[PDB]
Amino acid sequence: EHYISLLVKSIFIENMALSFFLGMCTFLAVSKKVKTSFGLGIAVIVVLTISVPVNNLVYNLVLKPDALVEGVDLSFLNFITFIGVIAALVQILEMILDRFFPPLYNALGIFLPLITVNCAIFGGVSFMVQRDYSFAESVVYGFGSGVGWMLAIVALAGIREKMKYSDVPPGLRGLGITFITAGLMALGFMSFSGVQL
Amino acid sequence: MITIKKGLDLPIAGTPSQVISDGKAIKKVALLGEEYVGMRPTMHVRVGDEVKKAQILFEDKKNPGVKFTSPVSGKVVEINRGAKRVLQSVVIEVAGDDQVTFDKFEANQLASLNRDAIKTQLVESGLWTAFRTRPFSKVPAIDSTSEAIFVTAMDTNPLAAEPTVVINEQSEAFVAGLDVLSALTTGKVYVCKKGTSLPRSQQPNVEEHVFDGPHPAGLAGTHMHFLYPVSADHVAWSINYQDVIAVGQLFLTGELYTQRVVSLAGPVVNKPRLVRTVMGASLEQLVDSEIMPGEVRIISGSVLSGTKATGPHAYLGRYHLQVSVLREGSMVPIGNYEKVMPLDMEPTLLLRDLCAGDSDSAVRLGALELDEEDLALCTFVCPGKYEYGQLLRECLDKIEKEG
Amino acid sequence: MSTIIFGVVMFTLIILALVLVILFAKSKLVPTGDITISINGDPEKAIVTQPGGKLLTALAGAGVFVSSACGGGGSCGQCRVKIKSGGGDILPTELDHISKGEAREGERLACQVAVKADMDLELPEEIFGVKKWECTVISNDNKATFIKELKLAIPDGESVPFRAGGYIQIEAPAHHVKYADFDVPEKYRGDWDKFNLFRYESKVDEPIIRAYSMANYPEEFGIIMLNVRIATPPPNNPNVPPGQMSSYIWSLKAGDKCTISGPFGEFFAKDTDAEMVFIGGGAGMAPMRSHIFDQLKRLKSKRKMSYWYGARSKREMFYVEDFDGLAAENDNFVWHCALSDPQPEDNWTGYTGFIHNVLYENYLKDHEAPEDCEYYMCGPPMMNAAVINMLKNLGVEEENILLDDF
Amino acid sequence: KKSVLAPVLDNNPIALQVLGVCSALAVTTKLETAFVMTLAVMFVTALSNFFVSLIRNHIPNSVRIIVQMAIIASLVIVVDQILKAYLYDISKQLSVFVGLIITNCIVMGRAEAFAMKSEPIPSFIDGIGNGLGYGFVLMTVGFFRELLGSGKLFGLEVLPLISNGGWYQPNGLMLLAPSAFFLIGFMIWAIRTFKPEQVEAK
Amino acid sequence: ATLFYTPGLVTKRSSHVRDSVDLKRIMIMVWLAVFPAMFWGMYNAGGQAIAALNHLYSGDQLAAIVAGNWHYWLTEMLGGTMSSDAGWGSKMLLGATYFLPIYATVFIVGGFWEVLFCMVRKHEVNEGFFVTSILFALIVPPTLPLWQAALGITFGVVVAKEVFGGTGRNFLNPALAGRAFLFFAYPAQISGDLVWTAADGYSGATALSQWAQGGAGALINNATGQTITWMDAFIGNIPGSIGEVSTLALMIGAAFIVYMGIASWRIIGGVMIGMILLSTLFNVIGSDTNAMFNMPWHWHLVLGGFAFGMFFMATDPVSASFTNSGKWAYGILIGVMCVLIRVVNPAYPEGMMLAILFANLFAPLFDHVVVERNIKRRLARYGK
Amino acid sequence: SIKKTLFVVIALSLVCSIIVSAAAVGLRDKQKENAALDKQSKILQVAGIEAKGSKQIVELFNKSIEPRLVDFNTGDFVEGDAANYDQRKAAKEASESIKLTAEQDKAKIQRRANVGVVYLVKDGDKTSKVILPVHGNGLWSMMYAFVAVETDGNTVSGLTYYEQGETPGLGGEVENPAWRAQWVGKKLFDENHKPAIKIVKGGAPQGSEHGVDGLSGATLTSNGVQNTFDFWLGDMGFGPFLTKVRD
C-alpha cells in the first residue's frame, strides 16, 4: 500500500522529533510526565492532521503559482498563511482545554500557545508543498508525523519517569540531562537512516 | 483451591518435631510497644506497680479505647524507652494468680451475641489487639467495623509450627472463637487453611479456603489479595489461629487465655519441637538449656520476618508464634523479585518506588495491600541489600500522615 | 500593483475566515456571562465577577483581603480559601503546600483556582470586620534594654475584641526619625551609648504596616499594651539601614497618635484540660503574658500552668511583679526565668543558662508525661529551634507544640 | 545595557528558557551559518517584540496569536526576500532555516511573555538580548562542531585534515545532531555549576 | 561520624537470612561468562590474520611485512610463527597482541572516569565497569586504534552512565553507546573490508556484507578461497569482531548466567521470536532483487553480533524492561529491528547495536503499559 | 468586542500583506538575475570556459551558449523559452511530465518531464559540445549534475554536481575535483550504444573507457550516480536525442 508506506515512514524513518529534530522546545520541556506528554502528543497529532491538509488546499487552490490567475503566483503568501492556519487551530485548542484544563492547560502553561511554533507543525506543512502530496497523502503525512512525535515525547517521558531512581548531578538535572537523553535517543533512531520509504 | 507457585521455602536446618511439650518455666514477660503500629502509649503503670492478668498497662492516644493489658499477674520491673522516649517494652515479673474475669457464655449463644457486646469484652481484656487492619496493619479502631475478618489457620514460615497440631488440642475453643468472629464481622470470616481438615463452624458466615504452595501462601496479605482485595475503602482484619483459640476461651470461660504453643527450632536447637509458653515470654529464659554452645541469635518470629530477641526486645512478640535460633556467621532485576512474589503486582517497580520514597506511586502499585511480612522474600533475594519492610512502612507511614 | 492587490485580498480573506472560525469557537467553546461567588452563607458577601480565571483577583476587587505576600504564583502559600463547591480540582502547585487531608476538606490556593462557573467559598469571618482605631499613646516605657512597652488608649471609650495570643496592625505614616530622639532611660542606655546605637536614623518613603502581638489580656479594656523590639541593623549584616516600624514606635512618646487595625491571630490557647507550659523569649513576653492573664483572670482556669522566660541579665526581665503576683495568688501557676549571663549586680540565685536546658532539667526531664502537656512558645528563632528539638527528643508531638514565629 | 546582557547568562533562551532549540542543532555545523542565523534571529525578534507592544493594548486575546504570527512571519518573509535578492549565496546555505526562524520559539515566546505586558522600547531591548544568548549558544556549539567535525573555524583551516596532508581526522558525529544535543547539555551543566541560582529542585 | 546509645525495632526486624547473590558476584559471573568467547576471539583473530598474510605475501616479502608491524614480530619474539604452519598457540598469541592493548586501554581509561565521578561525588566505586570494559573491547574490530577505543569508552562510561548517576541509574546500554560513538564518529575504522582482518593490505568482506551483495553464494573466505559454511559461522571460524564470532562460545557462557538467573530468559526468548518471525516473513514474501530477504533464521543467528548482543548486552538488567511481560516485548523489538536493519536498511550491514539502543528507549513504555493495566485491574479489585 | 477584533485583524492582515507583497513583487526581478547567474556560472565551469563576475558570465554565456529544448519521447528539438523553461516545475505537473514505472525509474526520479532543456556550446557558429542536465537519487538526497558531452555524443567532456546532499568525505566526493576530472575523456555509451558508464568498486582498469572509480567506502552514493546515468543515458532520458547528435 502506498498509504501504509507513507505512514510508516513519517513515524519511524522520518520521526519529526528524533529523526528531523523538530519541535524540541516543547519536547524537552513538557517531557517530565508521560500523561502530560501523551496529552500534548495527542494535541499535536490533532493539530498536524488538520493543518497540513488545510494548507494543501489553500496552496493548490489559491497560493500555488498560476492557481487563481494565469501569471499571478501568490506563493509568497506561503509562510504567513501556513503559520496563520496553524495559529488559528491553536486558539481553538487552547479553548478546548475547558475539558482538559487540569492535565494540560496547567501542565503546558506558557507552552500551550507555543504549540503553534513547533517546527514539526510548520516543517510538516512545508514538506507537503515541496513534495507532491495529495490530500489523502497530506492526511496520512500529518497524522503520521504527529504519531512519530508523540512516540518520542511519550518515550522520553517514560525514560525520565524511570530515572526518578537516579542520582543526577545538580546543574545537569532537568534541562541539561534532557538534552543528553535526546542526543542518546537520536542515536537509536538512526536505525532507520538508510531505509527507503 | 487456590494454588501458589511463585514463592520460596527456605531450607533451613532444624525443623520442629511438631509434638507439643512443656517449655521452660517463664518468670518474666513483656509487651513490646513498637510492635503496635502508630501507638502512642498512655502509661497506666509505673515500675514497682503490681498488676493482674488482664489489667491495663497502657492505652493508645491515637487509637482511643484500645487497652493493652498484661499477659500475667505480677510486678512491673522496668519500662524500657528508647530514642525520643519511644516505649520499647513493659516487663512484668511473673508472680501471682490474680486476674480480671469477664462474662462467660454457652457455646451455642456466641454466634448470636451482640456486636457491641463482643467488642466491649475483647477491648477490656486486651485481646482486641490480636486484630490488625490491612491496610496499614494497625489495631482496629474501637468504633470501626470490617466486612472481612481473615483467620490465618496455616503457617508456611520456615520452621513454623503446624496449626492443625495446636488447633486439634483446642477444637472446642477454636470453633467457639469462629462463632464469635461470625457475630463480630459485618460480612464473612475467611478461614484460610491448608488442605488438611480442621474443626468447622456451622455458621454460614464462616468460609474455609485452601491455599497450597511455597511460603507466601500462608500470609494473610496473600489470602486477602485473592479473596478480599483491600484498599483505603475496603479494610480487612487479620487474626491468627492461636488468638482465635484465645477468643473462644475468653467467651467460654470469661478469662484471658495467654497460653501459646510456639515452635522452638533452628540449626542450634538441640531438640527442635513445639513448646508451651505464655504471651510475651522471655526468650532468654525460654531457650535456656536448649541451644548448642556458641554465639547464637534468638529471633522472635520466623527468620524471614521477625525481631532480634536482644535487650528490651528479648521477648516473644505479640503476633509471633515461633522462636528461631541461628548461629552468628541496587534493585538489579534478575528475575529475582518476580519469582518469589505471587501477587498481581509488578515487584521490580513497586520496590523501586519504596526505595525512591515515591509514596503516591507505591500506593498505585499496591503498597496499601502490604505488610512487612509480604516483602520478606524480596528482601531475601535482593542482590542489592535493601530492607523493603522498612521502606514499605516508611511509605505507609507517609501515606497515613499526609492523608 | 496588480498581483500585489491579488495577494493582499486573498491573504486578508483567508485570515478573516480563520478569525471567523476562531470567533465561532469562542461562541460555542467559551460561552460566558457573569459568575456568582458566594462567601460563607451571607448574600451580602458575594462577588459577581464576570468569569475571568482568578479568584484572588475577583476577591480582591470585591473587598476581601486574604494574605497574598507573593502576589500569586503559588509561592507564599498564604492565600488559602475553602472552595467547597466550584473551583474544579487542586493543581499540583497548590498541593506543594496543601496536604492531601487539607485539600480533601476543600482547601485551595485562591491565586491558583480559576473562576469558571458559580462557586461557593468559605473565608474566615474575621476578614470582613477589620476596625481602625486612631489611638493616643499612654506609655512607651523601656521594659528592657531593647524592648519598649507601648500603651495605646482606645478612643471614645471603646475596647478591642481581641483574643489572648492575638495581634493587631499598626499603620505608621512616612517619617524620618532619629535614634537620638528616643527616650531610652539611663538604666538601659549603657549598651546604647557603647555601640553608638543613637547614630541610627530611619527614613521611610511610603506609609508602612506591620503586626505586633498584644501583651494585655482582653479584660484590660481601653488599652492595647504591646511589646516592641528595636530592629537595629543585624549583627552579621551591620551595613544595612535600620528598622522601619520599630524605629518609628520607639520615636513615639506620650500624647502621640498611632493608627491601628485588627484584631487577628491564630496563636490561641487550646480549650482542653492538659497542663500548659509556656516558653517565652524577648518580645515573646507579650503573647505569653496575654495567655497567662487570660487563663488566670478571665477564664479563671485551674489547669496546671508554668512559664519559662529566657533573658540575658536581670535588667532584661520585665513584668516580674505581675507573674509574681499570679504565681502567689494561684497555686496552679509557677513562673521562672533564666539568665544567660547574670550580672554582678544581679546577685542572681536562680536558673542560669538557656531556657531549653533549664526547663528540661528542672521540670520536663523527670516529668512522667511530657507528651501530655500543651506547649506554647514565642521567642528568638535560635531559642524556638532549640526548645522544639528538646521537646521532640522527649516524645512531644507537633500537635502539642504551637509556636508564634514573628 | 544590563537588560540586554541578562538573557546571555541569567535567563538564556536555550539554557534557562526552552526556546530556539531546533535551530541550534541544525545550523551549528559551521560558525558562519550560526552567526548569520543569530543576526537574523536578533533582527526579527527585536522588531517583532516592538510591533506587538505598539498594539498590545489593542489586541483581542482570542486572535492574539494570529495577530502576532502575522507580524513574525511577515518580518521573516521580508528577510528571506532581502536575502534572496542581496546575499543570494548566503540565502542558499540557509535553506529552510530562514523560514524556520518563524517557528523559533524565542521570537514568539518573548513576544508573548514580554512584549505584550511591556513597553515597545524595552521590548526591543529584550529581543536583542535573547538573540545574544541564542547566539552565545549557537556560536559555542558551532565552534566545537566545526573545529572537530570539519577541522575548520569560519572556513579557515585551523586543524589540518588528513585528507589535506595533516593529522586530524574529523569526528563525524560532530556533523550530526546528537553532538549538538550533547554540547548544549554540557553547556547548561557549566552554566548552572557557575550559577547555582538556576539549578532545578528535586 | 558518631556512635549512639539505644536501638529501635525497625533495625531489629533486619534480614536475618539473606541470599548469597550480591552485585559483586553478579558482575564477576558475567565477566567470566565472556571468557570463552574472548579466548577464542584471539585465536580466531590470529588465525584469520595469519591466513590472510600467507595468501597475500610469501618469502622475503612476508618477512618485510612481519618486520614492519609490531603485532607480527612481537609474536615471533615470544616463540610464535607467522608461517602458515603456525599452531593454535601462535594464533592465540597474535590475537592477544591486538585484544589486550584494546582491553587495557578501555579498562584504564574507562576506570579513570569511574573513579573520578566516585572521588568527586563521594561515592564508593562500583564493580559494573568490569562488564562494560570487557564487552566494549569485544565488540570492536581487531584493528581498532587505541585512541579511538579511549574515546569510545569515555562516551559510553560518561555520557551514557556517569552523568546519569552511574551504575544502576542509567537507561541506555553503556558499552554499545561507545561503539555507536565510534561507529558514527570514525566509521572508516569500524566499517568496510579493511578492519575485520589484521592482514595488512588485505580487503575482505564479511558474511553479512557478502550475503547482502550476492546472497549465500557470495559467502567466500578470500584468504582461503573456500565457502563459508554455517558451521564455520557458528564456531566463529569467520572474519569479524573479537568475541562475537563464535555463536557456540557465546551460548556456553550464556547458559551459565541464564541458569544462575543473572540473564533474563524472557528477553533472550523474545529476541529469538522477533528474529524468526520477521526473518521468516521476509523469506515468504521473497525478493528477486534483495538477497537479504531470503536469509533464514538460523543464518541470521550465527552472523554478526546477534548472539553476543542477545545474550550479553540485550539482557542488561538496568536498560531492559523490569516487567516480565515487558521483557518479552523488549526482546522482540530487538529481534525485529536487527532483521529489519539487516534486510531493509542499505547503509548498515548489522543492526543489533542500533536495535538495542532503539529498544532501550522503548522498554520504559512497555513497562508503563503493563503497570498501568495492572493499576486498572487493582482499581477494579481484580474482579473479586 | 467582535467589532474590535475584526477591525484589528483585518486592518493588520491587509497592511502586513501589502509590505510583504511589495517586498516580494519588487525584489523578485533582482532575485531572478541572481538565480540565472548561478546556473550560468556552473555551465561555464564544466564547459572549461573560465568566467568570473556577473558582467563576464552574462557576456560570455550569450557569446558561447545556446540553450535549447528537447522532447525526450522523440529526441528532437522543440521551440520554446529555453532560457526560462523550468524542468523541475514541469516534472511536478502531469501536463508537462509523465510518471515512471519501477522498471523505467532506475535513478529513483519519481517523474520525468516531457521536455528537458539542453545547452549547446559553440566555439564559432557551430556547436562544439552539448551540456545535458541529469539527476538521480543517491543514498541521502536527490543529486543534480550537468554533463558536457563532445560532438561525438559518446565522449564526455566534463561533469559537475551542482546540487547534492550527502555525507561530506565518504559519499560527498561527487564535488571533489579529482573525481570529476576522471570523467573527462570517458565514453557514455558502448559499442552497441547502451548505457555503459560504470562506477567501479575498487578502481577502474587503467585506460578504461567507461570506468570511473567509485567513492571509497561510499558504494551507495556511487550506486546512485550509476542509476542517474542509466536512466538519462537511455531511451526514456536523453538516449534518443544523443542518437541524433551522434549522427
Ligand SMILES: Cc1cc2nc3c(=O)[nH]c(=O)nc-3n(C[C@H](O)[C@H](O)[C@H](O)COP(=O)(O)OP(=O)(O)OC[C@H]3O[C@@H](n4cnc5c(N)ncnc54)[C@H](O)[C@@H]3O)c2cc1C
Ligand atoms: C503575629 C506577629 C506578632 C509580632 N509581635 C511582635 C512583637 O511583639 N514585637 C516585635 O518587635 N515584633 C513583633 N512582630 C514582628 C513585627 O511585625 C516586625 O517584623 C518587627 O517589629 C520589625 O519591624 P520593622 O518593619 O522595623 O523591621 P524591618 O524594617 O523589616 O527590618 C528588619 C531588619 O532587617 C534589617 N535590614 C534592613 N534593610 C536590610 C537590607 N537591605 N539587608 C539586610 N537586612 C536589612 C533591619 O536593620 C532590621 O534589623 C510580630 C509579627 C507577627 C506576624
Ligand SMILES: CCCCCCCCCCCCO[C@@H]1O[C@H](CO)[C@@H](O[C@H]2O[C@H](CO)[C@@H](O)[C@H](O)[C@H]2O)[C@H](O)[C@H]1O
Ligand atoms: C560528546 C560529543 C563528543 C565529544 C568528544 C569528541 C572529541 C573529538 C576529538 C577527539 C580528539 C581527536 O584527536 C585525535 O588525537 C589522536 C591521538 O592519536 C590523533 O591520532 C594520531 O595518533 C595516532 C597514534 O599515534 C595515529 O594512529 C593516528 O593515525 C593519528 O592521527 C588523531 O588524528 C586526532 O584527531
Ligand SMILES: CCCCCCCCCCCCO[C@@H]1O[C@H](CO)[C@@H](O[C@H]2O[C@H](CO)[C@@H](O)[C@H](O)[C@H]2O)[C@H](O)[C@H]1O
Ligand atoms: C529455542 C530457539 C528456537 C528453536 C528452533 C525453533 C524452530 C523455528 C523454525 C522457524 C520456522 C522454519 O524456518 C524455516 O527455515 C528454513 C531453513 O531452515 C527456511 O528455508 C528457506 O526457505 C525460504 C523460502 O521459503 C528461502 O527463501 C530461504 O533460502 C530459506 O529461508 C524457511 O523458509 C523458514 O520458513
Ligand SMILES: CCCCCCCCCCCCO[C@@H]1O[C@H](CO)[C@@H](O[C@H]2O[C@H](CO)[C@@H](O)[C@H](O)[C@H]2O)[C@H](O)[C@H]1O
Ligand atoms: C516502536 C515500537 C514500540 C513503541 C510503540 C508502542 C508504544 C506503546 C505505548 C503508547 C504510549 C503510552 O500510552 C500510555 O497508555 C497508558 C494506558 O496503558 C495511559 O494511562 C493513563 O492514561 C490516562 C489518559 O488517557 C490517564 O488519565 C491515566 O493516568 C491512565 O489511564 C498513559 O497515560 C499513556 O500515556
Ligand SMILES: Cc1cc2nc3c(=O)[nH]c(=O)nc-3n(C[C@H](O)[C@H](O)[C@H](O)CO)c2cc1C
Ligand atoms: C547480565 C548482565 C549483562 C550486562 N550487559 C552489559 C552490556 O551489554 N553493556 C554494558 O555496558 N554493561 C553491561 N552490564 C553491566 C551493567 O549492568 C550495565 O552496564 C548497566 O547498564 C549499568 O547501569 C551487564 C550486567 C549484567 C549482570
Ligand code: FES
Ligand atoms: S498569593 Fe502566594 S500562594 Fe497564592
Ligand code: FES
Ligand atoms: S525552535 Fe521551538 S520548537 Fe523549534
Ligand SMILES: [Br-]
Ligand atoms: Br525531470
Ligand SMILES: [K+]
Ligand atoms: K542491502
Ligand code: NA
Ligand atoms: Na558469528
